[PDB]
Amino acid sequence: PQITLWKRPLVTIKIGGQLKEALLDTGADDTVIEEMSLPGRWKPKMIGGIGGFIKVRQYDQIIIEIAGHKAIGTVLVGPTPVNIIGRNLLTQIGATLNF
């Protein structure tokens, strides 16, 4: 598919058995998902953005479906206003920027 940038590039994702809306984000190194009760072991992490840092939980080898395309990798969970799909997962679904 091709997505224009007139509006935020939001798509449907599936994670932990739940459907959510998330932003395809070429400026994010990491994938950050809103607070949810994911099972299993995690490691403490701090991540930065414009504004400063927030505390998150790092989960490894998490399955996520992005606009119908399957991926598996690291997902950070904590208090974000928007679910963001970063480059660690955009590469797995074959995404590029074109102009």
Added chain:
Amino acid sequence: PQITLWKRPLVTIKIGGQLKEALLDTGADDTVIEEMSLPGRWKPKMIGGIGGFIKVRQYDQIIIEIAGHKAIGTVLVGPTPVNIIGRNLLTQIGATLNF
């Protein structure tokens, strides 16, 4: 060009006649550049992201060259950690996401 996402999508820009490095960022609504002297009129504004809100100078109708392509639009100047090119200027140069 077609840009893949295994590395950060960094390009050269020209702004106020000066060369800088900046990130092509589909997750950003706006364009935010590090503190600099810039010819043009400005007004105070506040913007947010992952760790909270910061104070910036808003400059309208600024000429900027992005990887060899011309844009003329709004640039925010302030204590951002990384120079970011957001959707207000990505749309001007014809950029799309593809997968």
